[PDB]
Specification:
The PDB classes it as lyase. 2 copies of one chain form a homodimer. Chain A is mainly β. In chain A, about 15% of the residues lie in helices and about 40% in strands. Chain A has a 9-stranded antiparallel beta sheet.
Chain lengths: ~180, ~180
């Protein structure tokens, strides 16, 4: 497998990663300022997001940091260490997302107004802060600006289909 | 100059760092779950904080990530790369802190209730997200649980006094 050294090595990479509890998250560095993601397990299993604007930097050779804030009010700081197949993410959830996570379980792009209305109506504090390491179980070279990577809701067998080479074609597109 | 390799190498280190605009921040890894800080320039110059609880991990050899949330509602994710004298910090400010930063300019420990009252009374959104690199201009081995390191409000020449060896005694204490 390739060694990650530059920002360019990182961008266009499609990741699946697993937590200790077994929860599976999926994330794609679409370009130098945009991320797509899809959640397979845990509190917000079923949630997926495209075109989330983010700050993406290389901290040092092969280590990458992504910062963003969400329509729900959630703040995220993700650090990728792909050469060690490791990730560390900190999610700062507003109180209301901890209380009513199901509201955020949707294709967010079609419900932006609802997320914004919710974050003003319900409680913000205290925040649920979740700083956790994850193990990277899949890395794919999707290329940049590939709209097929995260283009539908998650389904039960999806991470397996992706890893087994049954989801994408030879060009990392959906047939 | 010593090489940082372990979490223990990092803990007990007292940092001063400068942004490109000239603003100076000061931060101390007091123990594996506690940080003190002091702000010398910028939006919240004059603010200082002790005993802030934080998540502190080593991402990989010599790279350290610190996550915390504040009585004001502010979320912080700091990444230290001390072997390269570099830091990257992302601060997610609630709207009200951007609007009224002077409210947060105090010794926070004596005004916790005021911070909590303010974060409920004023606007949270949109967040001011500030992801920026900084250059580390001072690293001192303070030891862990040193209550002298950040123990008074900042003053004009303080960073100079610290760097020039005029602030602390031989044991990293205040005379």
């Amino acid at each position: 497998t390739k060694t990650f050294k530059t920002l360019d090595d990182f961008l266009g990479t499609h990741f699946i990663y697993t937590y200790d509890n077994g929860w599976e998250y999926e994330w794609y560095a679409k370009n130098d300022h945009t991320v797509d993601y899809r959640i397979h397990g845990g509190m917000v299993a079923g949630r997926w997001v495209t075109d989330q604007k983010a700050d993406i930097v290389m901290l040092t050779e092969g280590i990458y940091k992504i910062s963003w804030t969400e329509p729900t009010g959630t703040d995220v700081a993700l650090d990728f260490m792909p050469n060690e197949k490791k990730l560390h993410g900190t999610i700062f959830f507003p109180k209301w997302v901890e209380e009513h996570p199901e509201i955020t379980v949707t294709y967010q792009n079609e419900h932006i107004d609802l997320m914004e209305q919710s974050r003003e109506k319900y409680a913000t504090y205290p925040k649920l802060v979740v700083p956790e390491f994850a193990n990277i179980t899949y890395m794919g070279d999707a290329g940049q600006n590939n709209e097929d990577v995260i283009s539908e809701a998650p389904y039960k067998e999806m991470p397996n289909d992706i890893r087994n080479g049954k989801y994408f074609d030879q060009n990392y597109h959906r047939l």
